[PDB]
Design an enzyme around this catalytic site. Structure first.
Site, PDB file in Angstrom:
ATOM      1  N   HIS A  64       0.809  -1.221   0.000  1.00  0.00           N
ATOM      2  CA  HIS A  64       0.000   0.000   0.000  1.00  0.00           C
ATOM      3  C   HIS A  64       0.844   1.273   0.000  1.00  0.00           C
ATOM      4  O   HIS A  64       0.274   2.367  -0.060  1.00  0.00           O
ATOM      5  CB  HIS A  64      -1.025   0.019   1.152  1.00  0.00           C
ATOM      6  CG  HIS A  64      -0.446   0.082   2.542  1.00  0.00           C
ATOM      7  ND1 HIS A  64       0.389   1.095   2.972  1.00  0.00           N
ATOM      8  CD2 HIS A  64      -0.651  -0.713   3.622  1.00  0.00           C
ATOM      9  CE1 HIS A  64       0.710   0.897   4.242  1.00  0.00           C
ATOM     10  NE2 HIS A  64       0.087  -0.189   4.664  1.00  0.00           N
TER      11      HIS A  64
ATOM     12  N   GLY B 100       3.216   5.958  10.594  1.00  0.00           N
ATOM     13  CA  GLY B 100       4.557   5.743  10.070  1.00  0.00           C
ATOM     14  C   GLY B 100       5.196   4.405  10.398  1.00  0.00           C
ATOM     15  O   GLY B 100       6.333   4.159   9.982  1.00  0.00           O
TER      16      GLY B 100
ATOM     17  N   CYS C 152       4.225   1.334   9.486  1.00  0.00           N
ATOM     18  CA  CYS C 152       4.000   0.248   8.533  1.00  0.00           C
ATOM     19  C   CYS C 152       5.322  -0.282   7.995  1.00  0.00           C
ATOM     20  O   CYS C 152       6.300   0.459   7.865  1.00  0.00           O
ATOM     21  CB  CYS C 152       3.094   0.729   7.390  1.00  0.00           C
ATOM     22  SG  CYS C 152       1.451   1.038   8.021  1.00  0.00           S
TER      23      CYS C 152
HETATM   24  O1  LIG Z   1       1.160   4.506   9.661  1.00  0.00           O
HETATM   25  C1  LIG Z   1      -0.018   4.138   9.773  1.00  0.00           C
HETATM   26  C2  LIG Z   1      -0.459   3.544  11.088  1.00  0.00           C
HETATM   27  C3  LIG Z   1      -0.259   2.255  11.465  1.00  0.00           C
HETATM   28  C4  LIG Z   1      -0.740   1.804  12.761  1.00  0.00           C
HETATM   29  O2  LIG Z   1      -0.619   0.662  13.215  1.00  0.00           O
HETATM   30  N1  LIG Z   1      -1.388   2.775  13.511  1.00  0.00           N
HETATM   31  C5  LIG Z   1      -1.621   4.091  13.135  1.00  0.00           C
HETATM   32  O3  LIG Z   1      -2.213   4.886  13.848  1.00  0.00           O
HETATM   33  N2  LIG Z   1      -1.138   4.432  11.890  1.00  0.00           N
HETATM   34  N3  LIG Z   1      -0.927   4.175   8.783  1.00  0.00           N
HETATM   35  C6  LIG Z   1      -2.319   3.724   8.871  1.00  0.00           C
HETATM   36  C7  LIG Z   1      -2.571   2.689   7.789  1.00  0.00           C
HETATM   37  N4  LIG Z   1      -2.267   3.290   6.472  1.00  0.00           N
HETATM   38  C8  LIG Z   1      -2.812   2.687   5.340  1.00  0.00           C
HETATM   39  C9  LIG Z   1      -2.745   3.332   4.088  1.00  0.00           C
HETATM   40  C10 LIG Z   1      -3.293   2.734   2.963  1.00  0.00           C
HETATM   41 CL1  LIG Z   1      -3.195   3.578   1.423  1.00  0.00          CL
HETATM   42  C11 LIG Z   1      -3.921   1.494   3.022  1.00  0.00           C
HETATM   43 CL2  LIG Z   1      -4.602   0.768   1.589  1.00  0.00          CL
HETATM   44  C12 LIG Z   1      -3.980   0.861   4.271  1.00  0.00           C
HETATM   45 CL3  LIG Z   1      -4.751  -0.706   4.374  1.00  0.00          CL
HETATM   46  C13 LIG Z   1      -3.443   1.429   5.420  1.00  0.00           C
HETATM   47  C14 LIG Z   1      -0.901   3.765   6.349  1.00  0.00           C
HETATM   48  C15 LIG Z   1      -0.566   4.735   7.476  1.00  0.00           C
END
Ligand SMILES: O=C(c1cc(=O)[nH]c(=O)[nH]1)N1CCN(c2cc(Cl)c(Cl)c(Cl)c2)CC1
Ligand SMILES: O=C(c1cc(=O)[nH]c(=O)[nH]1)N1CCN(c2cc(Cl)c(Cl)c(Cl)c2)CC1
Lengths: 306, 306
Positions: free
Chosen positions: B41, B143, B145
């Site tokens: 993603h 951030g 991920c």
């Molecule tokens: O960094 C974090 C995060 C992780 C976490 O554990 N907790 C939190 O608060 N934030 N993000 C949330 C998930 N985001 C995301 C983006 C896209 Cl485009 C898709 Cl498709 C999907 Cl599934 C997920 C990326 C950014």
């Protein structure tokens, strides 16, 4: 979101851990530049345990009595000396993986990470607090002596603890890296006991702020108290008293949640008097006191390290 | 003695963490040999979040759309491909700090260490379990991920988890390193929820054995039960049923304490029906289910790693 007992990444420390043998005794040492640091009781035998004279024991030794191994490589001991309760072994090779470091003495209530080691080999990492009675509630088996505690400040490892012994109650005692014990303990196998412990109040408050940030709000109320009224109740429950300095330290968490410290203190006062009634806070059924205000900010806002 | 939530030393993993940028999105990647692994993603924008077509999004990209930084050094992307839900970025330089590794898929109930990272920089390490509903109760901020979960088997890092998203309840979901999600989740910003969780019974038993080893004995009794009688009570309390395989796994802990598993089950049955009555076990007022039988042996007997 979420909230875990989180330790510092240990890589920078793992490369400093060595094995030190003297006689039939092997334990862990810390190798920085060309010095290996380890507990001085490595030079004791079963005869000297109860009342050792460390100056006598050390004069009777030569460099070749000390075997230092960094994994497979052997380090040649070219000198030795004693600094309080630590032995400093000068070796022929400076550790190429020496990080930027300093030696700091921490205060009761502060937290650090422990790299538990056996035979110079890192086994696990965990977080703990220096208790008000100058012990730590660690997890250590035979052979763990010389394991170290540390914090990471940006790029710099701050070493604050070296492990020396387990007390009869199962808690642990050691020194700073200049060899000075935390608490009134001595490195001899006498029967020593820790004094009575108290709960670290400023840390309990920080944890309640972490709970609010993570959506646990059931313990809040709209009452407010004063420092002196709160401290009156805290004393009865074996809680450390709260100072104005503690209030200021909690500033960033009050700001981010909009709940004043003295407001939060009123919640804590109710929890101490009525208990939890079968409800949990951040997955605990007891009030947790081993997270500092800084630990909470770091985990609920997100500082990294170089 | 003692008992802590202990993670594996993270050094071997810290050297594999890189930063991956594509467009205005930056997250963490895992660099092993000449491949960088990261959540696919990273190639989404705000327009594609709700219903992305990853094959379309990837065809529209070239190697130079991907910025990979290992601290300061820039890694040149010379190829890219998708394996299920992970992106594999082929780079011009093989990671000289690549440890011996393998990719393994873990089962609900097993534990692993998480190296939480931001901008390719390791921030903290903690231990957690894969829950029966295929989520983990992690601690992650924006951030994070691409952060990974791992175990260490002797000299070999077994990677088992890569972080992809936080669900609405605050729990976390991700994939194995071949890109296959744990649980029925998809990498799109729809509203997905975890199914109901259960308590991992074999782990609760292992923890009670850890307590006995550390001198907590107040919950024992001389009754004994059968698998089928115990499982009848466990079902009512949302505990996973106990299998004969679980009994065999607990063998070493039964042997070291001389308490039979079905004897210990009778204690657990009483704890579930009468509660703890304000008493604690290993410093907890709740029954803990995130230590496996192996975690307990490792911490109450003392295995190291190479
Ligand atoms: O960094 C974090 C995060 C992780 C976490 O554990 N907790 C939190 O608060 N934030 N993000 C949330 C998930 N985001 C995301 C983006 C896209 Cl485009 C898709 Cl498709 C999907 Cl599934 C997920 C990326 C950014
Ligand atoms: O490895 C452990 C250990 C540590 C721990 O935390 N828990 C545990 O069970 N064992 N040892 C116990 C303390 N030992 C010792 C030896 C001498 Cl000669 C002196 Cl003088 C002193 Cl003070 C202490 C060394 C060996």
């Amino acid at each position: 979101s979420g909230f875990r007992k989180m330790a510092f990444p240990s890589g920078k420390v793992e490369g400093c851990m060595v094995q030190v043998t003297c006689g039939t005794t092997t334990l862990n040492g810390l190798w920085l530049d060309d010095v290996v640091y380890c507990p001085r009781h490595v030079i004791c035998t079963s005869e000297d345990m109860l009342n050792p004279n460390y100056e006598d024991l050390l004069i009777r030794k030569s460099n070749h009595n000390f075997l230092v191994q960094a994994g497979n490589v052997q380090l040649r001991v070219i000198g030795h000396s004693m600094q309080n309760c630590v032995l400093k072994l000068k070796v022929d090779t400076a550790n190429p993986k020496t990080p930027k470091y300093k030696f700091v003495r921490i205060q009761p209530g502060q937290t650090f990470s422990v790299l538990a080691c056996y035979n110079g080999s890192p086994s696990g990492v965990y977080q703990c607090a220096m208790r008000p009675n100058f012990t730590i509630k660690g997890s250590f088996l035979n052979g763990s002596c010389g394991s170290v505690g540390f914090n990471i400040d940006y790029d710099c490892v701050s070493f604050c603890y070296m492990h020396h012994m387990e007390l009869p109650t199962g808690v642990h005692a050691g020194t700073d890296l200049e060899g000075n014990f935390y608490g009134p303990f001595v490195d001899r196998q006498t029967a020593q006991a820790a004094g009575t412990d108290t709960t670290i109040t400023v840390n309990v408050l920080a944890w309640l702020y972490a709970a609010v940030i993570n959506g646990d709000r059931w313990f809040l109320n709209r009452f407010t108290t004063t420092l002196n009224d709160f401290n009156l109740v805290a004393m009865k429950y074996n809680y450390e008293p709260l100072t104005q300095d503690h209030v200021d330290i909690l500033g960033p968490l009050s700001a981010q949640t909009g709940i004043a410290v003295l407001d939060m203190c009123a919640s804590l006062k109710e929890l101490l008097q009525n208990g939890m009634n079968g409800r949990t806070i951040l997955g605990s059924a007891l009030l947790e006191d081993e997270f500092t205000p800084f630990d909470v900010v770091r985990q609920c806002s997100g500082v990294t390290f170089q």
